[PDB]
Amino acid sequence: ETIAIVDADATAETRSLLSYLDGVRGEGILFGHQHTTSFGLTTGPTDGTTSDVKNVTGDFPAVFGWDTLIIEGNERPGLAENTRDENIALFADYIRKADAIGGVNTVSAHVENFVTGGSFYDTSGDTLRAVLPGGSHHAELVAYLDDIAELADASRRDDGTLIPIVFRPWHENAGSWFWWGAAYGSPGEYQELYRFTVEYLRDVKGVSNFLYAWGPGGGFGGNRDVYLRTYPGDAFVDVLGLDTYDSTGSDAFLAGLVADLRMIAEIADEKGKVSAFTEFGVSGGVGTNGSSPAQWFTKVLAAIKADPVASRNAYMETWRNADAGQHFVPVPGDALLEDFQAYAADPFTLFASEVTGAFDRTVAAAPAQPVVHIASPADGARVPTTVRVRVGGTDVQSVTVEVAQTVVDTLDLAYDGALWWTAPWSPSTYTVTATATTAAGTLDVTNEVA
Ligand SMILES: [Mg+2]
Ligand SMILES: [Mg+2]
Numbered sequence: 001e002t003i004a005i006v007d008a009d010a011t012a013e014t015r016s017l018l019s020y021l022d023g024v025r026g027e028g029i030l031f032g033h034q035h036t037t038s039f040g041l042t043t044g045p046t047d048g049t050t051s052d053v054k055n056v057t058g059d060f061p062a063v064f065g066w067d068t069l070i071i072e073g074n075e076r077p078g079l080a081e082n083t084r085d086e087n088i089a090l091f092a093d094y095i096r097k098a099d100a101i102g103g104v105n106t107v108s109a110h111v112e113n114f115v116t117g118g119s120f121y122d123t124s125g126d127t128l129r130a131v132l133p134g135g136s137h138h139a140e141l142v143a144y145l146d147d148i149a150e151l152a153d154a155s156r157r158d159d160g161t162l163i164p165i166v167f168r169p170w171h172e173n174a175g176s177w178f179w180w181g182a183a184y185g186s187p188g189e190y191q192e193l194y195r196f197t198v199e200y201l202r203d204v205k206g207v208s209n210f211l212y213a214w215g216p217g218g219g220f221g222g223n224r225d226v227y228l229r230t231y232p233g234d235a236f237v238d239v240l241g242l243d244t245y246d247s248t249g250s251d252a253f254l255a256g257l258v259a260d261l262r263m264i265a266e267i268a269d270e271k272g273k274v275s276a277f278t279e280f281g282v283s284g285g286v287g288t289n290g291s292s293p294a295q296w297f298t299k300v301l302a303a304i305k306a307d308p309v310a311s312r313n314a315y316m317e318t319w320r321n322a323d324a325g326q327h328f329v330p331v332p333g334d335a336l337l338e339d340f341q342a343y344a345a346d347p348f349t350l351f352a353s354e355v356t357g358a359f360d361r362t363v364a365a366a367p368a369q370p371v372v373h374i375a376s377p378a379d380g381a382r383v384p385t386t387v388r389v390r391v392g393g394t395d396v397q398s399v400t401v402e403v404a405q406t407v408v409d410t411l412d413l414a415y416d417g418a419l420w421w422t423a424p425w426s427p428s429t430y431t432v433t434a435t436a437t438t439a440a441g442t443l444d445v446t447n448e449v450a
């Protein structure tokens with residue numbers, strides 16, 4: 001078997017996981033839970049071995065979700081008193097335990113606001129643009145990504161084998177609740193953020209156990225044009241996702257959801273990639289500060305199962321069981337408990353003990369697709385600066401840039417020794433076209449800038 005994978009030199013276990021995730025589509029959907037062994041309402045103090053899901057269904061989820069907030073010391077097992085390095089050691093320990101249980105690990109990144117010192121919910125500071133290549137706070141993103149690379153390398157089985165992780169950075173960017181969202185950067189600025197993240201981890205740090213997930217949000221009504229507006233590209237994404245919460249349980253909701261789920265499944269099928277329901281749940285959760293829409297879990301599942309295309313999604317993850325006010329997996333006292341248990345007992349939903357042959361497959365990577373993109377200035381950006389061009393997946397002889405408004409400037413770039421071909425530029429709508437002469441032929445790309 002030969003598969004399209006973002007990291008063409010990913011570990012055998014990592015290519016196996018991507019193979020497994022595609023093959024499971026339409027046969028069964030893996031249930032996922034965020035912080036499943038680190039936050040619980042029925043577990044007592046957590047140590048990476050107990051889960052609310054296990055306690056109420058008799059099995060751990062098939063997908064264990066985590067966050068880089070652990071590294072920051074803002075979420076258990078991470079502690080604010082700890083160094084980032086000991087938080088990383090705790091993080092890797094919990095991933096190791098999940099793997100031993102038989103689950104698949106996924107990691108999101110609720111990244112701190114580098115500019116303001118605030119949280120991921122602080123949308124001031126112009127932080128997205130500040131962390132892009134050439135940005136005033138770019139070094140801080142680099143430091144943050146180094147910690148992630150460190151975590152990836154610490155995530156090893158007892159025998160030394162790297163545990164595959166589905167890394168899902170910069171999620172829900174079609175909305176504006178996070179500082180990396182749609183109101184704080186053009187689609188092109190977001191794309192360069194995502195591309196840089198992949199390239200820094202894979203190419204500069206040599207991370208080999210990552211699959212890359214991208215999930216811009218939910219509620220697209222099956223509109224591919226809106227959904228793919230911020231699509232980073234085939235060379236950057238392994239898993240296409242969708243994040244949708246509801247508390248109505250209405251026919252209108254389920255119809256819109258099915259439309260989005262078949263949309264992502266079609267796109268993934270066409271591209272030879274995987275699609276997944278990356279986040280789902282009752283809005284506000286199922287606790288005292290949430291809702292109990294009648295039979296919500298089984299209604300969602302029935303709507304998915306009834307559709308032969310919508311059901312072609314590898315996993316569906318719900319959110320963290322923080323406290324009585326805010327939790328997403330029902331516990332005794334919650335009206336939705338029995339319905340979740342019914343959802344869990346459905347043969348279509350897969351839990352930890354039902355995950356088999358995920359990591360031991362023999363599969364080859366398709367050769368990496370050659371790419372060129374202008375990292376600065378990003379498409380849609382407002383502009384002395386440095387033009388940065390990335391050429392990946394091939395040997396490069398030269399890179400030339402033409403600025404047009406009629407051509408007003410021609411730049412010959414030089415390789416910087418690590419990532420970009422660059423040149424100085426001293427600049428009402430410019431067109432910036434990069435042309436790379438490579439061993440895979442001529443590649444070009446055009447960014448439009450104000
Ligand atoms: Mg590598
Ligand atoms: Mg089941």
